[PDB]
Amino acid sequence: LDPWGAVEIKDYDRLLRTFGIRPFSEVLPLLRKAGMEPSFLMRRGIIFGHRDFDKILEAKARGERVAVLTGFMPSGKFHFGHKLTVDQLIYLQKNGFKVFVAIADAEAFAVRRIGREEAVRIAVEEYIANMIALGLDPKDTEFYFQTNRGTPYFRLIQLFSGKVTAAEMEAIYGELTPAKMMASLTQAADILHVQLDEYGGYRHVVVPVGADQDPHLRLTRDLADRMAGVVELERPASTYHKLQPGLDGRKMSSSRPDSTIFLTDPPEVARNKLFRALTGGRATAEEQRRLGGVPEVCSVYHMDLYHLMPDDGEVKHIYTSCRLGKILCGECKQIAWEKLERFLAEHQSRLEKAKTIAWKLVEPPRF
Amino acid sequence: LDPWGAVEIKDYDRLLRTFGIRPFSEVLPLLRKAGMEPSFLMRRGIIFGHRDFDKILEAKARGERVAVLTGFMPSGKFHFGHKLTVDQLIYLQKNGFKVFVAIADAEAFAVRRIGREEAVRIAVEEYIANMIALGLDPKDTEFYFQTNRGTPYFRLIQLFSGKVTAAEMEAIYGELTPAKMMASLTQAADILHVQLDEYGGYRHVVVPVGADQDPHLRLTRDLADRMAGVVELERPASTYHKLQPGLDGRKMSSSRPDSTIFLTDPPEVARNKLFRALTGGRATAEEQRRLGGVPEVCSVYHMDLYHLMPDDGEVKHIYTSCRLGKILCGECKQIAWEKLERFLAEHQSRLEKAKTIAWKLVEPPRF
Ligand code: SF4
Ligand code: SF4
């Protein structure tokens, strides 16, 4: 009777301990002392790990302003993979964190060959505007473009290039083009620059990521240590989330549009994508009733768990019912659909106004 | 009877034509139309080549403001190798060019492992202050640090990283560390950024260099062409000088201090370095009188030709006399010494005041 899936995380939390990644539960008491209750993603163990988030919460409890930072590639449409990250920002923002959102338009240009005008458009109208419509505060959130962030941020990138080898970078990202080399240093600057006085002096910063992104984060923490004597930087903290599988059971992508719901999908389009999702269902109505289903492998159940059913009781009932033989996939899908239809409609009603607001929250680069 | 050494330059001007480098003499008529008389380095064929300097002079003649740009590595002491470059800047500055001088402090840090505080010190008190004492105008010269030059300059570096391959860079500089990769893009930005409106909009820029520096300049001209559609850049022009050999007949270096006169050398120290220089002299006083000497291989004669004797007649007389058997190396050295002693004394009398002025011509970077 395992709705949260504790046994799926004990298996590799052993291996991640090698990199100093800890179970998230060890910060519960610090989370309390900081006056914070866990979010539902924390309760459900979707946020399963942390490194140094205790130090962040210690700073926060003695009254220091603390920050969270993440970046977005302005390519393709905003989807529920992206929403999971923003939802973790909004939680932290409501609990007092300064939020920084980097737009990776330099990487978009140099690595992905995305045009300047288009990167900027997509960043504002697809990324920033969807983030605002989700509930990220337009006033207090600091959005910026990698190509328009200013001298002190770029000076770190210049000085970092002396503190890492080609082999170190190769180990993380593969073949080392000038563009991928630049992107790797710029991403470390995205994390660390908020610690400079020019950007507000936020020494304690947490970055929410998947495990698969830890190698770059470790190179960033090395860069902080290697800058000692030049500029004093703290190693960034991190929280670790399990990635939501796409509706096909493969990785969630704007590329493979059928297995990702976009936040801008019209209701008929989203419903059909949802109804086509892979489930843990069985041969037939008949066989499902005797044995029940397998929520552990069902992308509908993961949509409920990660997004559509914040209420623990309600998503437990789905799990129980499916595991007891009480529910078929057709009805389970329409239940998830009704939650999604309401979410999309309220979100989309906010989006045209968010887009207007968005063009005023940033200075686009001149070229 | 060849004082200028025309036959030493016809030999490889053939090979450099492969790269579109032309004899400098082809710009003489443009130089006239621009209201300019050749400098002595041009007359002597020490400036032997150009690429696209005609386009610069065409812009200048129709009244456009034109620019020259070069960079200096703030490492070690300022020597007569550096003076040859500044002398070409001063000539162009007196003929109306805007001069830009880049300090390579990012490269100094990341590639050469030179500390921040020391790079900055050396740049101001050893490089900028010696340039001012030489006659570079403190008001109209634009000096800057790579690490403090601002957003639009750094954006080029970020966008350039998408337009060059690892193999292209490898071909120019060897093993491709993150630092050497960064330095190569930053050096192209040093040349091209002056064309942006933010730095004055100087589309027509000339860079004075040795032939050995042309591979990087060609990659810079490729980067200009490859940016079409993103930001419109003109291919930079260049003039080409023969390098002055050190007093030992090897390359002139702060590393091998005996074969370079530093502008700050006290008179006794410079005199001795000069008196130890390799000459084209012979076994003995006796054998020199019959045959004469060999100025073509004499580092004393090259000091006269590149610096100490601007007057064509006077340096011709040295050549003639040595080639006629009329002069021994001891007297030739003391003649060159008297010119150098006067030059050093007037230069050094200007230097303490130049250092004061220098700290006001730049904003040093904060870290
Ligand atoms: S009944 Fe629901 S949770 Fe169970 S396998 Fe089907 S879609 Fe998934
Ligand atoms: S006489 Fe002068 S120019 Fe001739 S070889 Fe000696 S030092 Fe050189």
UniProtKB/Swiss-Prot annotation, chains A, B:
Work out whether the entry's keyword set contains Thylakoid.
no
- Show the SUPFAM superfamilies listed in the entry: Nucleotidylyl transferase
Principal cellular location given in the protein's record: cytoplasm
Report the locations given in the UniProt record: Cytoplasm
Sorted alphabetically, the keyword list is:
Aminoacyl-tRNA synthetase, ATP-binding, Cytoplasm, Ligase, Nucleotide-binding, Protein biosynthesis
Concerning HAMAP family, the annotation shows:
Trp_tRNA_synth_A (MF_00140_A)
Q: What is this protein called?
A: Tryptophan--tRNA ligase
High-level lineage: Archaea, Thermoproteota, Thermoprotei, Desulfurococcales, Desulfurococcaceae
